[PDB]
PDB file of C-alpha atoms (C1' of nucleotides) in Angstrom:
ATOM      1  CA  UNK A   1    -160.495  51.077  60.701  1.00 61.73           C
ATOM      2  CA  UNK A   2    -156.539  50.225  61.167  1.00 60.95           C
ATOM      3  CA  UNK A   3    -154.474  52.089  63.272  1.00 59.74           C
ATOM      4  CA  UNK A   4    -150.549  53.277  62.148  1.00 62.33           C
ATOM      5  CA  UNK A   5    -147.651  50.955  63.800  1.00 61.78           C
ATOM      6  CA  UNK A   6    -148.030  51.435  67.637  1.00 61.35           C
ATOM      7  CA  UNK A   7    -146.037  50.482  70.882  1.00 63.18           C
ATOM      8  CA  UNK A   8    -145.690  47.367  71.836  1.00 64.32           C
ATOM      9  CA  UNK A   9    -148.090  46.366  74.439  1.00 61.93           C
ATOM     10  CA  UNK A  10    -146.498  46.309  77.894  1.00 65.42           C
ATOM     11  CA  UNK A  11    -146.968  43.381  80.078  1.00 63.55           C
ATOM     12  CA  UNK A  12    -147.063  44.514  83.784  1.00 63.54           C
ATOM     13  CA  UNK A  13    -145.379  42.168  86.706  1.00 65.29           C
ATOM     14  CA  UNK A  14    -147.471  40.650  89.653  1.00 67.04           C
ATOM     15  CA  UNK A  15    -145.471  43.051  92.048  1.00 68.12           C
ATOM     16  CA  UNK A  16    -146.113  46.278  89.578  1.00 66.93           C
ATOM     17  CA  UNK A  17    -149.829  45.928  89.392  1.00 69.09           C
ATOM     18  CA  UNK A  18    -149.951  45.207  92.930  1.00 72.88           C
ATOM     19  CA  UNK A  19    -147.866  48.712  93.565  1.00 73.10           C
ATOM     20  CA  UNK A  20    -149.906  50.283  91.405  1.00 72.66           C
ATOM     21  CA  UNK A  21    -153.500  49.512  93.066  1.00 69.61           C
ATOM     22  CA  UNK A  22    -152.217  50.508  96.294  1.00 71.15           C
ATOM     23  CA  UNK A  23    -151.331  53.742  95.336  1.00 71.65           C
ATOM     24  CA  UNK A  24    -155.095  53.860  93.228  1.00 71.11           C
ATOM     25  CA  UNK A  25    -156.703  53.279  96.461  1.00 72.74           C
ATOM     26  CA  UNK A  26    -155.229  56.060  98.185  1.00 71.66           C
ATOM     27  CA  UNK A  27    -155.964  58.234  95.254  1.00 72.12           C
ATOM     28  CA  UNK A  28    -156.854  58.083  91.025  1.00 75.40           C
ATOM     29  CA  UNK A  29    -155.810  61.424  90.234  1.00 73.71           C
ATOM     30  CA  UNK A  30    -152.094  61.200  91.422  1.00 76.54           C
ATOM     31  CA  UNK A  31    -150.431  64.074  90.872  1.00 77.67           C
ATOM     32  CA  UNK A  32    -146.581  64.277  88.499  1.00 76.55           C
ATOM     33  CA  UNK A  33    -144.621  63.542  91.749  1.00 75.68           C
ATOM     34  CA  UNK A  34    -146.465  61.272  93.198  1.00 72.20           C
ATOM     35  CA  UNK A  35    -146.475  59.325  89.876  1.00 73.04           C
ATOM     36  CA  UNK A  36    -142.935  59.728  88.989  1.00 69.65           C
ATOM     37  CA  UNK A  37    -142.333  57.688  92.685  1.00 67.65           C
ATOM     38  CA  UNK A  38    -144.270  55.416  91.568  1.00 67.24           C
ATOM     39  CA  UNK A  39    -142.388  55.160  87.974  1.00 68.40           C
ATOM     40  CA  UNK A  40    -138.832  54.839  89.963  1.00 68.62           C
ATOM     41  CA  UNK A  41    -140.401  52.478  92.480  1.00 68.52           C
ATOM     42  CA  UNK A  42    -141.962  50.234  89.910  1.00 69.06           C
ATOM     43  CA  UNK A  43    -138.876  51.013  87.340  1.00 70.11           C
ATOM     44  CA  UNK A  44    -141.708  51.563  85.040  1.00 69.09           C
ATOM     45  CA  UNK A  45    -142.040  55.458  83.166  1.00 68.92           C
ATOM     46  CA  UNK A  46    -143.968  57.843  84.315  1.00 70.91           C
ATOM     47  CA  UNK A  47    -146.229  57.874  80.864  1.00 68.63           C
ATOM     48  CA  UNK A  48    -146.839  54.051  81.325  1.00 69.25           C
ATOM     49  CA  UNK A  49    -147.645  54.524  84.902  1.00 67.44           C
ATOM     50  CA  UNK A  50    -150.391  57.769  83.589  1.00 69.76           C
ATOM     51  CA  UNK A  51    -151.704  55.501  81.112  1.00 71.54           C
ATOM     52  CA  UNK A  52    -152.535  52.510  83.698  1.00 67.06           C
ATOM     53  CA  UNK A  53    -154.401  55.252  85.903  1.00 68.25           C
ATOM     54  CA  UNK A  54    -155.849  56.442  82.334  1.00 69.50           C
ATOM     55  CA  UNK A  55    -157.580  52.454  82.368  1.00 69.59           C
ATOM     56  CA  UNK A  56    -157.929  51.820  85.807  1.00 71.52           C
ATOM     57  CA  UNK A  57    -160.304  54.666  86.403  1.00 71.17           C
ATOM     58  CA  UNK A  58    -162.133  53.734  83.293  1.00 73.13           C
ATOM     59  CA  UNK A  59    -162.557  50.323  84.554  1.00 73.94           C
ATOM     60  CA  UNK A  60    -163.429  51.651  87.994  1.00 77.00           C
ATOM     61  CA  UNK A  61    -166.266  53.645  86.607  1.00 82.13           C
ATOM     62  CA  UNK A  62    -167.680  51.103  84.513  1.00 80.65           C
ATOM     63  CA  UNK A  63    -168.091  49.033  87.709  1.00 80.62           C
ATOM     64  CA  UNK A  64    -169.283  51.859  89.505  1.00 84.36           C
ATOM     65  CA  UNK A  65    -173.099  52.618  90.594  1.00 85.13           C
ATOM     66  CA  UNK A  66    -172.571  55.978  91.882  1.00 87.63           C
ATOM     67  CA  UNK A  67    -172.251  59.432  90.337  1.00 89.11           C
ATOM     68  CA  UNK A  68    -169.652  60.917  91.769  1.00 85.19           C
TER      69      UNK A  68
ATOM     70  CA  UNK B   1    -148.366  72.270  95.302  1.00 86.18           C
ATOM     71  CA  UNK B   2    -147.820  72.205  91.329  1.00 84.23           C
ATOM     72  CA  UNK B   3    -149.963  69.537  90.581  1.00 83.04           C
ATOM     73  CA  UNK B   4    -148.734  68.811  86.970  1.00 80.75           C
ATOM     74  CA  UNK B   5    -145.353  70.261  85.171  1.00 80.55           C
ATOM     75  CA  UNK B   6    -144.714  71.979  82.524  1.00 79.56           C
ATOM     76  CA  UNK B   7    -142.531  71.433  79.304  1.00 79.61           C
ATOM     77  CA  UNK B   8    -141.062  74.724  77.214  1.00 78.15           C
ATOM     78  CA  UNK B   9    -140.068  73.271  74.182  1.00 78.26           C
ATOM     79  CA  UNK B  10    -136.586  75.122  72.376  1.00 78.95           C
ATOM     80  CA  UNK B  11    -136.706  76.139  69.141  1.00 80.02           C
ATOM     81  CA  UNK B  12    -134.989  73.533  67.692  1.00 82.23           C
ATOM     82  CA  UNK B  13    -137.185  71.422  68.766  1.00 82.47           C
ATOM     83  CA  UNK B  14    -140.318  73.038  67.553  1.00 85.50           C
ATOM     84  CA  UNK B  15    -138.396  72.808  64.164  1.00 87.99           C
ATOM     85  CA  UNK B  16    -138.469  69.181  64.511  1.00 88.14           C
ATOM     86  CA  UNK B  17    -141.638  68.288  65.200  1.00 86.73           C
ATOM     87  CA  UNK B  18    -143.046  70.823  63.077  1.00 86.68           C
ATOM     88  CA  UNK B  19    -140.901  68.962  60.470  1.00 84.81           C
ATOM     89  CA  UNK B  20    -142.667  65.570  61.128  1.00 85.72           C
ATOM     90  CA  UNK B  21    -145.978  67.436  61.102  1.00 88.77           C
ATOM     91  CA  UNK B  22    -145.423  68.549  57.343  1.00 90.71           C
ATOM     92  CA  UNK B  23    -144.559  64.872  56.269  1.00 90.27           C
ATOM     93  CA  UNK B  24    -147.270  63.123  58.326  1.00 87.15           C
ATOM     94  CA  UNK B  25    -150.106  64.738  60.745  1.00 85.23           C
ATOM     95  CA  UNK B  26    -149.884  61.244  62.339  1.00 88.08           C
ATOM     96  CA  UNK B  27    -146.555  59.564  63.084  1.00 88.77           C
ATOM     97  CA  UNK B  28    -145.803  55.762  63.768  1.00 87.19           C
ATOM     98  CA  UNK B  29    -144.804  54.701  66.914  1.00 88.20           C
ATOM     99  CA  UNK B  30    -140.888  54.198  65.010  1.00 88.42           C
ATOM    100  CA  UNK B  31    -141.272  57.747  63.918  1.00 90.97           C
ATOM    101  CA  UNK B  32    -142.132  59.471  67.393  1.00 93.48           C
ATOM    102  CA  UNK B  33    -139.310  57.241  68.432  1.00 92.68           C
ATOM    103  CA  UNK B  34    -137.141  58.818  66.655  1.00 93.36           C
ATOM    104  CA  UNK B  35    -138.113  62.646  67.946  1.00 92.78           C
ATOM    105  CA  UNK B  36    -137.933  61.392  71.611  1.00 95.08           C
ATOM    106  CA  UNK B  37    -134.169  60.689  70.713  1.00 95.51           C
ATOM    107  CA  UNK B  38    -133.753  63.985  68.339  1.00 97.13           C
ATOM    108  CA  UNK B  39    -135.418  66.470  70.355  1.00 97.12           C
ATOM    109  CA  UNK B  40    -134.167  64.806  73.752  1.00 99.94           C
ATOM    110  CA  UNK B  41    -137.922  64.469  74.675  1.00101.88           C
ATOM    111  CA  UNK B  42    -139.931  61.217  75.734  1.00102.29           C
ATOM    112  CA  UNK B  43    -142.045  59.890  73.752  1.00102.70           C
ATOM    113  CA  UNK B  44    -145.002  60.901  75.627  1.00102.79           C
ATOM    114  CA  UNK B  45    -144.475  64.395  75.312  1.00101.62           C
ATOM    115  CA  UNK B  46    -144.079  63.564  71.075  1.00 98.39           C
ATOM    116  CA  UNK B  47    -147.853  62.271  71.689  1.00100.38           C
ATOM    117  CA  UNK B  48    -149.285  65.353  73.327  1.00100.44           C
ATOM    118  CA  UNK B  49    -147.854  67.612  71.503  1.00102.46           C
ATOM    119  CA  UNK B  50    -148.562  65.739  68.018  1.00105.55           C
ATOM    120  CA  UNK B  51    -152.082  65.914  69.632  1.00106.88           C
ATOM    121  CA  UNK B  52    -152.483  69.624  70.370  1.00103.39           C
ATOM    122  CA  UNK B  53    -150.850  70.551  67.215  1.00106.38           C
ATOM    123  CA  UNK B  54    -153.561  68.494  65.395  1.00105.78           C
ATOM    124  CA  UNK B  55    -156.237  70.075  67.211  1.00107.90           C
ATOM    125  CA  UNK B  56    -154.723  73.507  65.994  1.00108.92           C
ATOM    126  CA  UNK B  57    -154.405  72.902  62.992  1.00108.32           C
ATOM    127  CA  UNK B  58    -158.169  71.486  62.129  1.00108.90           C
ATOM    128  CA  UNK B  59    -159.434  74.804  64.114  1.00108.12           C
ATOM    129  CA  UNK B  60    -158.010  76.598  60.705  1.00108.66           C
ATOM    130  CA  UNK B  61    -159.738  74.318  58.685  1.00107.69           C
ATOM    131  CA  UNK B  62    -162.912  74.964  60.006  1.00110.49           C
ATOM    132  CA  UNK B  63    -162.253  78.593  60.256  1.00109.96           C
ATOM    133  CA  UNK B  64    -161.537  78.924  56.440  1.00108.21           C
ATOM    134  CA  UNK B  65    -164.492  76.139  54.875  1.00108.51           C
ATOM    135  CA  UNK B  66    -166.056  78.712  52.066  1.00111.46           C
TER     136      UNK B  66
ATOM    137  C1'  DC C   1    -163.127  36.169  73.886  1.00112.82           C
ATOM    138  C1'  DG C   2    -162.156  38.646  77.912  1.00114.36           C
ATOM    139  C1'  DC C   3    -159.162  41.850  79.782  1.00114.59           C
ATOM    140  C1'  DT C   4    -156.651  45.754  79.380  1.00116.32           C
ATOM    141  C1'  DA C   5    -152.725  48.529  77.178  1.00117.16           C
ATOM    142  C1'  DA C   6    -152.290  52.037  73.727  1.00118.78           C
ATOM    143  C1'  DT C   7    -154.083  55.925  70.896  1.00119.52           C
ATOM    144  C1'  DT C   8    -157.282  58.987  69.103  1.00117.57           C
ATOM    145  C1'  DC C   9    -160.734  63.129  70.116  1.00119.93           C
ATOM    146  C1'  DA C  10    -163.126  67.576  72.308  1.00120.32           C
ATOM    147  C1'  DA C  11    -163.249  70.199  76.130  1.00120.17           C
ATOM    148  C1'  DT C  12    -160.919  72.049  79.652  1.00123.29           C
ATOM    149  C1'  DT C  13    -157.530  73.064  83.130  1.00127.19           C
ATOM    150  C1'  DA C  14    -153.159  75.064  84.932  1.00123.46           C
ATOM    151  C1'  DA C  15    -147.785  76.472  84.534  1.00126.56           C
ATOM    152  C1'  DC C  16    -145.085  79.752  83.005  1.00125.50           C
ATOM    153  C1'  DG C  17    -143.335  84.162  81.457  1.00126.43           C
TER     154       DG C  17
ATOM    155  C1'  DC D   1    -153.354  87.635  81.559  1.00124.65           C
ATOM    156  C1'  DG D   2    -152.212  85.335  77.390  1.00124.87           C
ATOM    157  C1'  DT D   3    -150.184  81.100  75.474  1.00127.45           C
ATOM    158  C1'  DT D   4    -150.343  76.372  75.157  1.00127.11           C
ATOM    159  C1'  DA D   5    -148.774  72.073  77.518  1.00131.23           C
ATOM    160  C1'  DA D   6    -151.055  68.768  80.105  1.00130.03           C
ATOM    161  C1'  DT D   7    -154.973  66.262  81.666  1.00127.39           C
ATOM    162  C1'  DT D   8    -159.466  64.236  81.434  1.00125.19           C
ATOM    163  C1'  DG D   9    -163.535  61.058  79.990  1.00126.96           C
ATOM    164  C1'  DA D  10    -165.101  58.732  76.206  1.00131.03           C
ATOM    165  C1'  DA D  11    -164.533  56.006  72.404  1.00130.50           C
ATOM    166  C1'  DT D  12    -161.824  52.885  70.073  1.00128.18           C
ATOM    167  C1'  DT D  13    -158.110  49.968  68.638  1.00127.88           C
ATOM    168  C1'  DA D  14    -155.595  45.829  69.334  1.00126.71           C
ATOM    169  C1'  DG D  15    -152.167  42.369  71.799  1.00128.16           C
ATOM    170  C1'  DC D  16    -152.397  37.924  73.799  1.00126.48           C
ATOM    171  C1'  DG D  17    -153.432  34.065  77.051  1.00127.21           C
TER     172       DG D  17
END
DNA sequence: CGCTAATTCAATTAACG
DNA sequence: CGTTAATTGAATTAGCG
């Protein structure tokens, strides 16, 4: 099935995904503030910064062996 | 500590999504776009609240099946 | 083709009045 | 406490070297 017209796919810079792991290693579940920081720091928005946490901890737990 | 934060939307702009519900249940990207501008909301919020309101609305649906 | 950004859902959690 | 906005995993769609 085809989805409606959707938003353009962003392309991340080496320096943003590198800010952006950092911050994933200290936590996944960052809360508003912390990821609004990270939104001014990375002059990304905080909804494209949600959605890479969205995908990075599905792509952590498809690597994962434990339950947690 | 308030985790997450919280958006009260006016009435206005309940009008105007409610507005795009009744022409489309699912908007394009270019008309979500437009709300974020209309309503003074991001697009992001457009998404979620598209998303509850479409949740709501096939709870009446399967509420009133006979 | 692989990687991953973007968008749906059901279920659920938490902010606000 | 009731209302509902926000968040989550899971599934899926799709852009683009």
């Amino acid at each position: 099935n085809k989805g409606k017209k959707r938003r353009n796919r962003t392309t991340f810079t080496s320096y943003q995904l590198e800010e952006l792991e950092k911050v994933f290693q200290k936590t996944h579940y960052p809360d508003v503030y912390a990821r609004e920081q990270l939104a001014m720091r990375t002059d990304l928005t905080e909804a494209r910064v949600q959605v890479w946490f969205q995908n990075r901890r599905a792509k952590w737990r498809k690597r994962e062996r434990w339950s947690h």
